[PDB]
Symmetry: C3
Subunit: 401 residues, 3 copies
């Protein structure tokens, strides 16, 4: 076995630096393209919703190579030269005051290797293995040391999502860890350098949050995983873009993940793994599908639908806990689609005379759904099944009290 | 230094696959032997308690190579071929319904590498670095990605005990991590890929739970460790089978661990590390002994007895917290044997005029035991010791209030 | 890339063993020097405060090579020979009883590789990857297995601070993890083998606790980091001794860290990284400075002062939570210096017409400080700023209720 070259830091939604016309970032808010050249060096920011901000043009002169874009600011970063220091620059436009942009130099011999924007704050991972926090208005906040060289960073609300190198992988594998922090009034380290699961012989392609606030990331083998707060903060695979690829040379380039409605916003690519900058590629929508067994049979189909519903509605409870604004109609509807799938699966299981499986499915139901399944059973009629469902209902009522 | 070959997945209680007549699994519930051959391919399940189920014979045809056995089901698993997929098969016999067995195919190019049974559920770790959960009745449940290739899995109640590869060890050492999950109504990740302690230049030989529900595992150097819930979920060594070995070629092959009464059920082996399938080996009982210093002196003897009692009665509090059924007489008796050992150790320490050590031991006592030690001291008589014990008793009463 | 030689265990505050007259330990309590020689082998203990204990001289005969010193005991440890076992020896002098010292042998072929003293207890990390706990009076307590070979251990109160090897680093880097435990009535594992951040191509030079009880450690590249309990138990850099070094050959040798008053007690070194034993080196005091950007400007200066105050007063809340004795005047004064820095930074930000930044700073203020900033704004007068501060004050009052 022999040591795997350790992946270099990158910005999710960016195309390589050697390009003449590259994407600095493409996310759910807009696009930031750079145009480096011997003649001019331009940067331009477009917004998907042209009402959030006007198209912004900047005369690139500091050779900013990293950028992130939020609904409230533009973050740019450049490494150091023999003349100048590595600089972090911010155009927080949503500000109500006259002074609009700030810029700060890192100490000598420290180079910005990754950046990201959250809600009201920005973060920079540097060559000194330091994480430096800022308000969008330019106030330096806490600083702490990283457990290893950064690979990529994402931000959402008060959450900071860091991926780095735990150590050295072997035979094509990376060895990445994740540090997950919450930067509110009550600071928390949700994930203390947990090992980051990847497909073997693959590297990290994309990281970020869904619009609703759930951490997600994408393999180089097309496998899309999402944090599963309802399962002990494990990582559940929710897509595999390779099944939407026709040849080995085909890839999908992720730009966005949305939970409600569910949609994987990516850009189809044919030659390489990233789209050429022009003509402007069309954003394709890929459906999420969890890698369940026997997906063609009705049972497996419905099981996949059920668990997809569950994991894609954990975020509602996350918004509720942290006092964010959520719409309880969506919780209700999530419940009812899940109970409908459970009822259909119990009917299906019942027509196959697998009544123990029916009781198992009823364990996942609400009391009302169970009360209804008791009658359904009492009509096939699996009378013993009806009794077992009745005892289960008694047990549920004993748990509520 | 040079990279250690990374141990292959295995099933605790199994003998190698190349054998003609092998043990697929030997645990506290029964034995599953396989007999692969060019003539016939048989599988047979025996039960230690012949009242739990009748001896079961299956006409092996799918070349199942992995198996686990619980008090309610038989789990079998086979990898994929060029013709067929990797299959998970279950004979849940304790079911009250007619339909008894189910079987499901994994997706194409995914191979089952480990399996285990819990209470009402089964789990499969696969070649895609996926953990797939099932009800014993065949309902697919949650799926999540593993941080590394699996080594072995065990299940008990709602607990899932996963051991895998954090990374690459060097100079004979493995680099294994443990993920410990609880799969009840409230999902929990107890251990987030904690590093799994091992003896140097040793690999993982056996993992599982004690009958009472505590995670345990065994080195290849004979060292038996158990989770210590009373010590921050660290891992405490509770045995060393090598001290019951007379020559380097002698080994003990673990099949069971019991906490009350304490017994390490293993099978003595002379030629190799595993028993030949026939004649049927006799299960030997080894005593647990924690690796304490100066075990021959009365002080060290009693210290070992004390801490053994403590760690082997943490499981009672675990059953109590999770609403399982425990017998409070056992808690009471555990308390009284511990207080007796403490009292004997305080008397011993007192006859050596080490009175500070006496007070230290009294810090571990109940109020009644301390109140009695005050008099004992008042009779040697270390009068100052009596006062220090009195002030300690006052402090204890201040802590209770 | 190629495997880094894995650093050997060491005792913080010690000079190499090959020296004729070496420091066994130098901490905030005193100094323990050893003098190994073919003629005599002496050990002597001095106390900074000559009232804690008298100078102690011991006729070294067991060739003790490890030592630690606390305000209540002297801990010594020697490896095993072909004749004798590895021994742990303790002179607990603060005891009120006649019997003063104890000594215990480790099992055969187990060698003490690290030791440390806490409050009322001592710990030994051994060649069997075991951690063995003792009372200072000689009672063996819990034992548990280490996830890797120890590098160094420190103790303070009920806290146990372990640093070890997670795995193998590459290209000059170590791969160290930290296990942080609390050994009170309620045992806790605060840190489950978290990755220990280090400067690249550097090893671990010093570990310990501040006098007030906060874990700290020092790079071989002079960077001093401290646990940040107010930031999710991350690690914040609080010093860089290299900036107090004039040439590459200059180093500082840490002996103590104090939080209130803030002072980094170290010894300046010119030839090597450690001081010669005589003449007795003078303890220098280095100021802590967090690595903030643009430290020369008034804004950066004040930001550094603010965050230094915050992190150096987390320990007060730690003492409060665990029922230790703290002085609430220090909490009050910490608050007022922080509010003064915030007020000065808001005035500075206001004179630059960056009013959004002013509101951001006010988010960190107390209600009274905000109420005062409302008037200040109302006088520049940024009237809109005054209103935004007023709405912020309303929001704060809504949070308190």
């Amino acid at each position: 076995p022999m040591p795997t070259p350790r992946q270099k830091p990158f910005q999710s939604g960016s195309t390589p630096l050697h390009l003449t016309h590259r994407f600095m970032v493409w996310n759910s808010i807009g696009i930031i393209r750079c145009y480096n050249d011997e003649q001019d060096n331009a940067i331009d920011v477009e917004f998907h919703d042209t009402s959030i901000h006007h198209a912004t043009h900047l005369s690139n002169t500091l050779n900013y190579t990293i950028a992130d874009l939020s609904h409230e600011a533009i973050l740019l970063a450049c490494e150091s030269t023999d003349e100048l220091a590595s600089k972090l620059h911010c155009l927080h436009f949503s500000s109500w005051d006259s002074s609009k942009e700030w810029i700060i130099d890192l100490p000598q011999n420290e180079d910005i290797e990754a950046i990201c924007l959250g809600q009201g704050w920005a973060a920079a991972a540097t060559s000194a293995l330091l994480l430096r926090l800022f308000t969008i208005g330019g106030v330096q906040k806490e600083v702490f040391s990283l457990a290893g060289p950064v690979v990529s960073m994402a931000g959402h609300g008060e959450q900071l999502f860091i991926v780095y190198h735990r150590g050295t992988g072997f035979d094509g594998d990376q060895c990445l860890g994740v540090q997950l922090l919450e930067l509110g009034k009550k600071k928390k380290q949700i994930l203390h350098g947990d090992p980051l699961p990847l497909t073997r012989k693959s590297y990290l392609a994309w990281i970020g949050f869904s619009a609703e606030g759930t951490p997600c990331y994408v393999d180089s083998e097309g496998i899309v995983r999402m944090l599963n707060r309802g399962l002990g903060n494990t990582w559940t695979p929710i897509c595999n873009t390779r099944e939407h690829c026709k040849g080995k040379s085909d890839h999908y380039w992720v730009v966005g993940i949305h939970e409600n409605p569910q949609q994987l916003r990516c850009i189809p690519c044919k030659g390489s793994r990233f789209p050429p900058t022009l003509p402007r590629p069309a954003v394709a929508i890929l459906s999420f599908k969890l890698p369940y067994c026997q997906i063609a049979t009705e049972k497996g189909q419905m099981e996949e639908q059920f668990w997809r519903s569950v994991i894609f509605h954990n975020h509602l409870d996350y918004l509720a806990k942290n006092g964010y604004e959520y719409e309880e109609s969506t919780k209700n509807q999530a419940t009812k689609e899940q109970q409908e799938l459970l009822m259909k699966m119990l009917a299906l299981s019942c027509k196959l005379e697998r009544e123990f499986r029916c009781v198992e499915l009823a364990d996942l139901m609400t009391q009302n759904a169970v009360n209804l399944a008791i009658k359904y059973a009492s009509r096939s009629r699996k009378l013993i099944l009806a009794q077992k469902l009745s005892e289960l209902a008694v047990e549920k009522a004993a748990e509520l009290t």
